[PDB]
Scaffold this active site. Structure first.
Site, PDB file in Angstrom:
ATOM      1  N   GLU A 177       1.036  -1.033  -0.455  1.00 36.47           N
ATOM      2  CA  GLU A 177       0.226   0.111   0.168  1.00 36.47           C
ATOM      3  C   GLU A 177       0.926   1.365  -0.280  1.00 36.47           C
ATOM      4  OE1 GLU A 177      -3.045   0.070  -0.315  1.00 36.47           O
ATOM      5  OE2 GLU A 177      -3.162  -2.549  -0.807  1.00 36.47           O
ATOM      6  N   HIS A 186      -0.883  -1.693  -9.736  1.00 34.36           N
ATOM      7  CA  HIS A 186      -0.266  -3.065  -9.699  1.00 34.36           C
ATOM      8  C   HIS A 186       0.233  -3.044 -11.195  1.00 34.36           C
ATOM      9  CE1 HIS A 186      -4.328  -3.562  -7.363  1.00 34.36           C
ATOM     10  NE2 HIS A 186      -2.721  -3.326  -6.482  1.00 34.36           N
ATOM     11  N   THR A 257      28.934  -5.422   4.317  1.00 35.98           N
ATOM     12  CA  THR A 257      27.552  -5.851   4.135  1.00 35.98           C
ATOM     13  C   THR A 257      27.365  -7.502   4.750  1.00 35.98           C
ATOM     14  OG1 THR A 257      26.972  -4.219   3.615  1.00 35.98           O
ATOM     15  CG2 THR A 257      25.304  -5.267   5.132  1.00 35.98           C
ATOM     16  N   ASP A 285      22.110  -2.223  -2.013  1.00 38.41           N
ATOM     17  CA  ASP A 285      23.723  -1.912  -1.610  1.00 38.41           C
ATOM     18  C   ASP A 285      23.767  -1.144  -2.094  1.00 38.41           C
ATOM     19  OD1 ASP A 285      26.613  -2.746  -0.658  1.00 38.41           O
ATOM     20  OD2 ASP A 285      25.422  -4.455   0.692  1.00 38.41           O
ATOM     21  N   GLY A 369      36.540 -24.797  -0.891  1.00 35.32           N
ATOM     22  CA  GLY A 369      35.355 -25.239  -1.297  1.00 35.32           C
ATOM     23  C   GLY A 369      34.844 -26.309   0.534  1.00 35.32           C
TER      24      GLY A 369
HETATM   25 CA   LIG Z   1      32.555 -28.438   0.641  1.00 36.07          CA
HETATM   26 CA   LIG Z   2      27.822  -2.709   1.854  1.00 33.84          CA
HETATM   27 CA   LIG Z   3      36.985 -30.629  -0.359  1.00 28.77          CA
HETATM   28 CA   LIG Z   4      29.757  -4.993  -3.173  1.00 22.46          CA
HETATM   29 ZN   LIG Z   5      -2.342  -3.116  -4.134  1.00 25.40          ZN
END
Ligand SMILES: [Ca+2]
Ligand SMILES: [Ca+2]
Ligand SMILES: [Ca+2]
Ligand SMILES: [Ca+2]
Ligand SMILES: [Zn+2]
Ligand SMILES: [Ca+2]
Ligand SMILES: [Ca+2]
Ligand SMILES: [Ca+2]
Ligand SMILES: [Ca+2]
EC number: 3.4.24.40
Length: 470
Positions: A177, A186, A257, A285, A369
């Site tokens: 809203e 919309h 961040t 960001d 990894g």
């Molecule tokens: Ca892994």
């Molecule tokens: Ca940032």
């Molecule tokens: Ca590994």
């Molecule tokens: Ca960045």
């Molecule tokens: Zn609406």
């Protein structure tokens, strides 16, 4: 021949496609921009006051009925009565302020608290007798008497607006809203329309709750699944639309961040508190070294750091996206077997436990990894030039694999690798080095045959020839 690992990467890189010339769900597919243009079709907007550097709008919570409430029929033809009026409760007010904030985070709007009363440019109040839906608002192109108002239905039978909270319908309704009061329509209905519409009546396919909180259609229509949760803040297409109107907020989260677990964005919808959390958000960001920390989830996840791309995080599908014009640098997977794909810049990807498939993309990435048999995929030599090579910070020969099977040179050129100790001047020569002292491994390949490596991969662990897949 392309491996299954490379196939999974290619598949996810193209998952949730938009703009294709094809008809998706019998509807034309729109890009993020075409969608933004559609959401802004009414051409309504607030005008920034003289001397103001940013649009400044005050808001206040109504304490008594106003003119429109007492005489709805003088403004909106078919509304004879709105029932009983009631002021926003303490919870509704707290939640309304979080939704307002989520809009100011992405655009250049400064919201000022005008308190209780009818003094704010934006006002909020509750009504008890439905006129069709659960709430309504007026776009900013109406006469001054109506501008900025949004009304929410509250009664003994319908309780969705009583307790808005992160992730629920009540909270999304507030965000939705307020969007209306700011200028957003919309995504559909204007050229025509009726009384009982369905997604079939959508103008474009991406008119679903996975791309815009202004939509009324389930995200399932487009393949996503938030499992009952609703986005509390603006989604991919909303950010793009509100930004065309009031510009991008380049002062937001300019530091390093973290989104997800261990979040430092004091925003409930960007934070995960447990493995059971259902996240739904679009990252906006404006700067710094950022990380998408999804370490706490045990489900198999698929993370994509490319802008405008969606990821399948924490059990849900297509629940996390990155807005247009945003560069997130790192991502951390959980204990499940994940798929982490980076973007053009240098990324830090950590697969954590489980058998992950890491794809760094362009730039010199630092790939970890973690526990388990992980595969490090490459699909282009420029993704690990000799000039700016990747670094596999924890390779384990006989467990981890370096996947080169999807490179053109192999899949089309039929190039065969000949492991030499010095480049002689033939294409396909690869030198697998390794200093036991530093415990630093290395792989260089000369694809052009000019006795100089074109593709290189630094290592911290041992890499045998049985670890490289082609
Ligand atoms: Ca892994
Ligand atoms: Ca940032
Ligand atoms: Ca590994
Ligand atoms: Ca960045
Ligand atoms: Zn609406
Ligand atoms: Ca994992
Ligand atoms: Ca990268
Ligand atoms: Ca790379
Ligand atoms: Ca070369």
């Amino acid at each position: 021949g392309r491996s299954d690992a490379y196939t999974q990467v290619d598949n996810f890189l193209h998952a949730y496609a938009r703009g294709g010339d094809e008809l998706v769900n019998g509807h034309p597919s729109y890009t993020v921009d075409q969608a933004a243009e559609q959401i802004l079709r009414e051409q309504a907007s607030w005008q920034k006051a003289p001397g103001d550097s940013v649009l400044t709008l005050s808001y206040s919570f109504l304490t008594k009925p106003n003119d429109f409430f007492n005489t709805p029929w003088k403004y909106v033809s078919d509304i004879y009565s709105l029932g009983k009026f009631s002021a926003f409760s303490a919870q509704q007010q707290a939640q309304a302020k979080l939704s307002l904030q989520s809009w100011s985070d992405v655009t250049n709007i400064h919201f000022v608290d005008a308190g209780q009363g009818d003094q704010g440019d934006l006002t909020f109040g509750n009504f008890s007798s439905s006129v069709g839906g659960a709430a309504f608002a007026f776009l900013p192109d109406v006469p001054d008497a109506l501008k900025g108002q949004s009304w929410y239905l509250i009664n003994s039978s319908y309780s969705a607006n009583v307790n808005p909270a992160n992730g629920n319908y009540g909270r999304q309704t507030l965000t939705h809203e307020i969007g209306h009061t700011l200028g957003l329509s919309h995504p559909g209905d204007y050229n025509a329309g009726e009384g009982d519409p369905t997604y079939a009546d959508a103008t474009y396919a991406e008119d679903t709750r996975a791309y815009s909180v202004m939509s009324y259609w389930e995200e399932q229509n487009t393949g996503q699944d938030f499992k009952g949760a609703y986005s509390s803040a603006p989604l991919l297409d909303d950010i793009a639309a509100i930004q065309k109107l009031y510009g991008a907020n380049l002062t937001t989260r300019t530091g390093d961040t973290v989104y997800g677990f261990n979040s430092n964005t004091e925003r409930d919808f960007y934070s995960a508190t447990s493995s059971s959390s259902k996240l739904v958000f679009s990252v906006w960001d404006a700067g710094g070294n950022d990380t998408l920390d999804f370490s706490g989830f045990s489900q198999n996840q698929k993370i994509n750091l490319n802008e405008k791309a969606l990821s399948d995080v924490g059990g849900l599908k297509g629940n996390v996206s990155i807005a247009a014009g945003v560069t997130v640098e790192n991502a951390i997977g959980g204990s499940g077997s994940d798929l982490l794909i980076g973007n053009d810049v240098a990324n830090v990807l950590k697969g954590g436990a489980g058998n992950d498939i890491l794809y760094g993309g362009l730039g010199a990435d630092q790939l970890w990894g973690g526990a388990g048999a992980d595969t490090f995929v490459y699909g282009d030599i420029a993704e690990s030039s000799a000039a700016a090579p990747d670094t596999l910070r924890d390779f384990v020969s006989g467990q981890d694999k370096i996947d080169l099977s999807g490179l053109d040179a192999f899949v089309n050129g039929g190039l065969v690798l000949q492991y030499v100790d010095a480049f002689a001047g033939k294409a396909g020569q690869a030198i697998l080095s390794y200093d036991a002292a530093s415990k630093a491994g290395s792989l260089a390949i000369d694809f052009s045959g000019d006795a100089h490596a074109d593709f290189a991969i630094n290592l911290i662990g041992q890499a045998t020839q049985a670890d490289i897949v082609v």
